Design an enzyme around this catalytic site. Structure first.
Site, PDB file in Angstrom:
ATOM      1  N   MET F  87     -62.545 -25.679  15.260  1.00 43.56           N
ATOM      2  CA  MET F  87     -62.321 -24.554  16.170  1.00 43.56           C
ATOM      3  C   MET F  87     -60.828 -24.319  16.431  1.00 43.56           C
ATOM      4  O   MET F  87     -60.431 -23.238  16.872  1.00 43.56           O
ATOM      5  CB  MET F  87     -63.092 -24.781  17.477  1.00 43.56           C
ATOM      6  N   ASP F 160     -66.061 -30.121   4.674  1.00 41.11           N
ATOM      7  CA  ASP F 160     -64.697 -30.149   5.215  1.00 41.11           C
ATOM      8  C   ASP F 160     -63.671 -29.693   4.181  1.00 41.11           C
ATOM      9  O   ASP F 160     -63.494 -30.324   3.138  1.00 41.11           O
ATOM     10  CB  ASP F 160     -64.336 -31.538   5.756  1.00 41.11           C
TER      11      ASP F 160
END
Lengths: 189, 189, 186, 189, 186, 180, 184, 182, 184, 185, 185
Positions: F87, F160
């Site tokens: 985020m 990721d």
């Protein structure tokens, strides 16, 4: 930790007792030596040199010692600054605490009559592979040699004697610490 | 742990599964090697020699390794007894498990095709005084030399190469372990 | 622990079948429970036959000195010769019990380790309680050194020096020291 | 944490010891490098540039290191701002701490005589599926390359030498650190 | 675990009595301890009769890869055909062992589930240590995919795709895939 | 945090600088929203500088900051230092266009949001539908702000994804890499 | 615990029990005392004439559990020989001195320790008084019995047990806790 | 507590009247604070008496000596007043007050005893620890002998077990000079 | 658990197994399911004709473990009579309904509970989707089988299992989960 | 703990009430709390040696020793200390309530007073337990003696009435002599 | 647990008593215990479906579910099940005591009986709490109705008597109808 109130022409000053003593160039080392403690002591020393580089500084020591690395940060700062740093042992100066006690300005290292001094060899640890253990072993032995060498210069004792005397925990009386060369005078009342 | 019961002329014999296999001179090592496990393996080897000093013993190995001294107890017992000890790797022979695999009778050391072999440095630790850390370091480095020397005698590799190959964890295929000389054959089919 | 059945139907655990051949296995730390078992095995074996040799395999990091002396004294008390065989490691009280075996019959396998050191203990409370505890452990040290001196041929002063810190010995060094009589080949 | 109270035309201004030193453009790093410490160091750098973009900044280092990421936030801020950032090692600059020590203005990187420098490779973790572990491994290997590359630029030692020298923990004296090119001068008392 | 008796006197537990009929029950997570029991039972059953079929019931969430290969290799090494029957769930290494059964003799009951997925692991420490551990688990992934390709008939590239995330298969879907040969009726 | 009786972050807030140097939770988002609203009230025309070093955190908390950024009049410059992950990278890309930066050695990481579901199948269905719905929300806003398609962002965030500062610029997460 | 088979199957302690040997190799609690007492009852029922051999390696424990064994030894017909191996401490040393006269032994390197009983008291002043009175009363009981069995006066025992007092086998014999040191 | 921000707590208020309050166990932190208060008060006034109220179960011998030696080092007389309990190192510090100026309130208790410690490790390490604590016992006894008038032999006997004194028995012993009457 | 000896020592559960009775008196996990399956295969091997009696007192548990028992019941040759005593909840009620037709019983005061399966999912959105998709599919599997065994429509069972649904034994009979309530 | 600001200076509510010579005891009695009460008592005497002090007591009691630090200080200082029980005065809290100036011991209508015997504990050797037993019995005698003198009851009666937990009403505490008046309304 | 040998076959005391058709309930009632007792009842019935069974009860109760598994088994089998309360029959234990064959429900003279409401829990949404609330209330009704049939007491009386813990003397339990006789001597 009580508060001292000081009144000036501009306003009031709220000092805690340690900060009021720092005003008179007194530094109180009364705990285990770690990074946070070493940071505080070095900062007080740098600050006091900046205030006046000619006036003496008084370092009171009551400490069981601790981190060798944190202790050398204090040691090196003492030798680096311009003012003489007087060392006064109250109660106990053990391990790195006694190493810093002996680090005070020549002729200005003191102990009160009932203060205790302890000297010993450094403690550490190693986990893992044999080569990792060898590295950690080589390192702790190297810092031992360094501590002995410096303590030799400051007390006048031979490196070999210091090695022998620190093999196991060695408790020294204030009078014995004078004889050993760790301090210069016992402050008789 | 299932039970196997057998009839003899003079009564019934209830064996646990591992005891039934021990009757056929098979020993199963399928855990970490500690003092207890070593005590059981050694006792099993001494028992099987006393039953028949001529017949081969079969040591199956699925072990992540463990204590070096517990490993050596087993190793030295294998070399002391008269019968040939065949070593069969199933699953994984890691660390001291791989040392024991290589310890079997020359020509009679085996691995199944998908079995894994791992070789590494011995692991350890030490806390306390510098001199105490020195003794423990010197000791682990000594057992490393001892492990390297024997492994060299049993694999045909040089000590210098074993030193280099074990510096970090080294994972071997069954066929790679044969080429290295840890086993003699890869058991088909 | 594996089972051995021979022929009613004799059902032995592996250590019990070895006990039948007069073999006692010490492969753990020495505490009161362990010492009690070993002493009990030694008394049982003498009861069975007071002439035949007993074989004591040792793989131990040591433990209670007091538990160690129970075993030691039982060995010297009984009639049969107790052969001691070090496998893996004989440390602390382990090495002491190894040196306690019948003279000429103390053995180590070639890669077995031997370690000798000072007894370990503790003291909490009043200054006088600490004094009593210190006096006591210093006395057991002397007792250990004297017995170890008699069994190795080394002087009491040398053992005191050599045990000041942890002293790791090779099997060959243990023989040279007098802790064992022979290193067992192959 | 001692207090210094100054008299100003406005009134009585009190600073904690570190805030009084901050007024002298001195930043004190005496702990692990995590995201909180980095945030604080970075803010202090941004504050001092805004006060004066010409005068030097003094960064005292006594750190075991920590987060590579937090370490780079400090590194990048140092290079970003206009003022020279002098770095001074007191006690210990280990891992990411020694990297930050090398990051000071060229010609203005120091260590006190008994300060220690340690260099090593970065540490990390990876759990889960084989592909997740592959992602983590590839990432840490890239940050290792990145750290080596920057250290090469800061010290004048090759990437190949630094890789070899940081395989295991490598402890350096102040003089060895100077020879290595991690610092410029050892400050004599 | 109830007791069955055959008239000396024969006292079996239920799994022991099933082992008489050459039935092995694998109904737990796969570890070295469990693989030990399974490998031993297989070796015992071969020694009793090297011709008769062995019946391996599987209800397992899987577990250790290496422990699973201990069982896998032992199944392939021994003479007798090992029938694999999946009940409830055969997940990960469980599904690998299910697929390891003798060709033509791999079974699942109608409402049993099969799950295939990537091997799991962990790396900690230095960058070089993480590299070794990453290389290792990628290597064992390749080994598992390679064998699953042989055993099922699917290509390596398809298995790689299909195991990227957890892939739950119906008994019928496992037959289509080639993990089993027949869904057991009724 | 060196203090005057003004801590260091308060002295910087005086320069319209907000420091985000931790995980993003409800407390952090509260503080930053409040700073953003405060800086607008001081001067609604002058730029704001938001430094980001963040492993990320609550999607919910991040959105409170995101929406506050877009809601207020002043331009909010985003500067990545060290790491902007999860985020944190989303908030980096959320700064005023042309005014998103990263220092040369800063790292950016993008990925899927994470969550949990417990209980009845229908409760697990509601929670699964919800997290899938918030992933679509994030991907859509990232598409608008990076210039990459939603289809590519879905592919790129499956696992990721670590990006170099120059790779982040190339991706469209930042506008420039701040030399020197 | 190994097994012995003659077909019969004993653990080693059960085998020794056949030769009228009881081993006390642990702390003395109610469980241990129950087991010892039961063995003493069993051996008497087997044979009321023959000697029983009680080997002691114990740090002691519960006084109340110790008196259960003590009283059982004096109640039964057979003589109970006590042999100290390793350590007989506290209530362990009390039970050692409880052996049949002329038949209390220690091996040459065995340790004997004597001291005050230990206890605790929590609550109201009146509750603490009761617990204090109780433990002082059990001390007097221990001292009085030790006096009868060693020959030492109560005044002497009180002093020698004030703090922990470690004795060698030779010192224990001289004290009167044992009759002989078992050589060789 | 209670606080005036003006923080200026109740003890700071009393410090201005040269009153130091010891109402807790004696460790390095407490000794640090007391020592600093003693040095500060001397710097304010070298001749004015200092008042040290003691209510303490004792604690660290080493920290207790820090306070003790500071008392003897400074110029002002340090009056000691026991309230509630002065136990172990606390009672030692009570006896350390200026002669003629050591007080207890009527219902205050005083307890004297042996120093307490520990020791784990090798036989030689336990020996070193035992020798040290025996040496600090002799050190405490000799100083108490000087300050109470009792002989070293008596103090040794009387501190063997925990010994609780009434204020009146503490005066008779020579630990205090007077019992403060209302 | 008590033991019973023949003229040969069984325990109670082992004794009842001779009468072809299997007792399910706990949560359903992989260990329990392993035992039950093994008892079912054992009893078929003894006699593939005679009936088997499965007593059920279970709070349920693992859906996977339940299907192992379910599928084995359907696979084997003998009829399996299910008798609910106390409670059959979650997968327990499912196995109760799994009995031979005409041969599914409950005692008068026995309780039955039906509900939807429970589960969990942590991690990435896609991992949570997979776990959600899985548990929804097993719920469809359960309703589908329950439909066949009870005679109620898939849509009704879905409605009735939305929340926890406790049934009296008589209500269980009307639902089609059992055949008769055993009197008296 | 709310702030009161005076213009002429921020005050704690407690230090604001301390200006009115009010001390609040509203917790267990340990060495820290006693230290604080003693300091407040000595401070108020320094302020004014003549004016009365008001000690509000809401305490489950605690340390006997800490209780006596407060008790002896009250007796020592020149000013009269009024005691007011609000809610509960138990154990050492009731002993302190009874220790207020003559005629100036109060409880509110619904305030409870509990009296009981001191609590303690002892571990170790018989002789150590004996020492600890003797000590707590001696402090029991001391407490009972002082209570006897202030209530007007015999030591014999106080010993019996404190054997176990004895809860008294405000009116009952007045009959007993622990307080002088119940404060109406 | 003591062993008994018969000429050789080894029983534990409980198994030796099971020979005499005695079942010992001396624990908390849970699913494990119920499973054991149920199995013993079915075993004894299979041995001889005419001879009486003796159930000794020393139990604080427990699971209502597990209690009913036992209850229903007692009524389902052919042999009369005698119930003997030794020590305590509380909660579900007193329910099972009342569940013995009529005329053959006993308590030893110092045995205690306790009756009360079932205990439970509920966590989550309002509707989930509503479901668990309705369930335990229905369970309360089922228990009360059966106690009414077995004691001869009205449902209204049992509801009022079980509102909180009701401890009964053995003689009170007889007057109540939980047992038939108190066993002398």
């Amino acid at each position: 930790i009580p508060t001292v109130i000081e009144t000036t022409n501009r306003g009031e000053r709220a000092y805690d007792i340690y900060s009021r003593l720092l005003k008179d160039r007194i530094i109180m080392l009364g705990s285990q030596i770690d990074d946070n403690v070493a940071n505080s002591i070095v900062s007080q020393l740098l600050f006091l040199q900046a205030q006046d580089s000619e006036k003496d500084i008084y370092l009171y020591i009551n400490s069981p010692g601790g981190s060798v690395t944190a202790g050398f940060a204090i040691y090196d700062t003492i030798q680096h600054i311009k003012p003489d740093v007087q060392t006064i042992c109250i109660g106990m100066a053990a391990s790195m605490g006694s190493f810093l006690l002996a680090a005070g300005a020549k002729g200005k290292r003191f102990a009160l009559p009932n203060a205790e001094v302890m000297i010993h060899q450094p403690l550490g640890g190693a986990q893992g592979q044999a080569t990792e253990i060898e590295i950690a072993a080589n390192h702790i032995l190297k810092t031992r040699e360094k501590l002995n060498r410096i303590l030799s210069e400051r007390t006048g004792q031979s490196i070999e004697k210091i090695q022998k005397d620190t093999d196991r925990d060695n408790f020294l009386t204030a009078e014995e610490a004078k004889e050993y060369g760790l301090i210069d005078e016992v402050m008789v009342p």
